[PDB]
Design a protein around this ligand. Structure first.
Ligand SMILES: N[C@@H](CCC(=O)N[C@@H](CS)C(=O)NCC(=O)O)C(=O)O
Ligand SMILES: N[C@@H](CCC(=O)N[C@@H](CS)C(=O)NCC(=O)O)C(=O)O
Lengths: 208, 208
């Protein structure tokens, strides 16, 4: 079945976990502690020396976005056709770009850069509000009328930003409604409220 | 057909151009100069405020990797099945990670960081040498026995590093043979030797 090997944080695995949970999929968590990681053997076996590591049967994958795309492809969360598939990728790449900035802030200069980051936030969130407005008036999902892996990644990105800058979504009616709507999905709602999710720190350095 | 809107540099469009050229595809280039870009209107219309912008009929795409994935999907350069597709993504994500570091070096601290970067290079290139060794002894492509969009992206990444650090591939027999083999493909060879490619700077700041 599925196995995700990762540190005891939400980080880059939050989206894929929400996806699995929401799609009613079963998976095993292999927690890697800072001690275990610093030992060296695991890191050494990792293709790019980083986690998450994911296993689907005997298929072993690295890179969170590769895992998301793999699940999107195998579970049918990759658009209804090629055109939509391209759009889903475009959304995900945008999410990834902002995620990199967020990660950089959190681990590079949280104290000093937090203000400038929050100031620039609206500009970074606008593209997604726009994408939503062009898709059935932002009533369904980010691309098309069926959920995609990009939706889970974007949802995660929005939720963690809500924590970073409370109220940042107030200026974006579509994104706000979107978050509320996706957060209300039965299986996803249950998962987001569970200890498994709630009791894990967002990041590894305690900053959020 | 296809239209790529980009600055007069190879940059993030080199791989997709090599792909189109090698697959015998026709495309139109819309050159955007620094003056035109600083005017503001174009940037404002770009989803994430950045180029390249790509058009396939009326499908307008942004993000180089989305473009590569779209072409890989429509032209059949995405593995023979899902498993291979996942591996192709994993390779491409790895290429993208190193590309970001390269871009950062080139535009952030070329003079000061060039030495440390070149020193760390072997460690960054090793994963690809490994992937190659596990695939028919590195005799064919990066994944499977048919070319994929990841091959073009990786080829570009290697070629630009050859320029940055001449001889960096000497320690990697498989990567070296791989580059020579792919560079010899008829259509690709012609393209790499053409003014269209040769007379374009690798990066926008003249550093390489
Ligand atoms: N591009 C990779 C990055 C993976 C990554 O950043 N991994 C970090 C944790 S989120 C890690 O393993 N750090 C430990 C190390 O590199 O030593 C992905 O998207 O999965
Ligand atoms: N993640 C995007 C990044 C695009 C990007 O970095 N674009 C740069 C040129 S390579 C750009 O348009 N810079 C102009 C600007 O942002 O003002 C991609 O992979 O295409």
């Amino acid at each position: 079945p599925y196995t995700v090997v990762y540190f005891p944080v939400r980080g880059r695995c939050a989206a894929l976990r929400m996806l699995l949970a929401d799609q009613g999929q079963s998976w095993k968590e292999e927690v890697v502690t800072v001690e275990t990681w610093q030992e060296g053997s695991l890191k050494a076996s990792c293709l790019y020396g980083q986690l998450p590591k994911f296993q689907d049967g005997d298929l072993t994958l690295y890179q969170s976005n590769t895992i998301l795309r793999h699940l999107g492809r195998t579970l049918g969360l990759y658009g209804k056709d090629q055109q939509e598939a391209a759009l889903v990728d475009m959304v995900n790449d945008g999410v990834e770009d902002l995620r990199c900035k967020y990660i950089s802030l959190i681990y590079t200069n949280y104290e000093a850069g937090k203000d400038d980051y929050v100031k620039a936030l609206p500009g970074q969130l606008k593209p997604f509000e726009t994408l939503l407005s062009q898709n059935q008036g932002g009533k369904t999902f980010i691309v098309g009328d069926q959920i995609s892996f990009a939706d889970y990644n974007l949802l995660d990105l929005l939720l963690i930003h809500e924590v970073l800058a409370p109220g940042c979504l107030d200026a974006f009616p579509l994104l706000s409604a979107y978050v509320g709507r996706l957060s209300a999905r039965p299986k996803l709602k249950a998962f987001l409220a569970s200890p498994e999710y709630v009791n894990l720190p967002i990041n590894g350095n305690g900053k959020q």
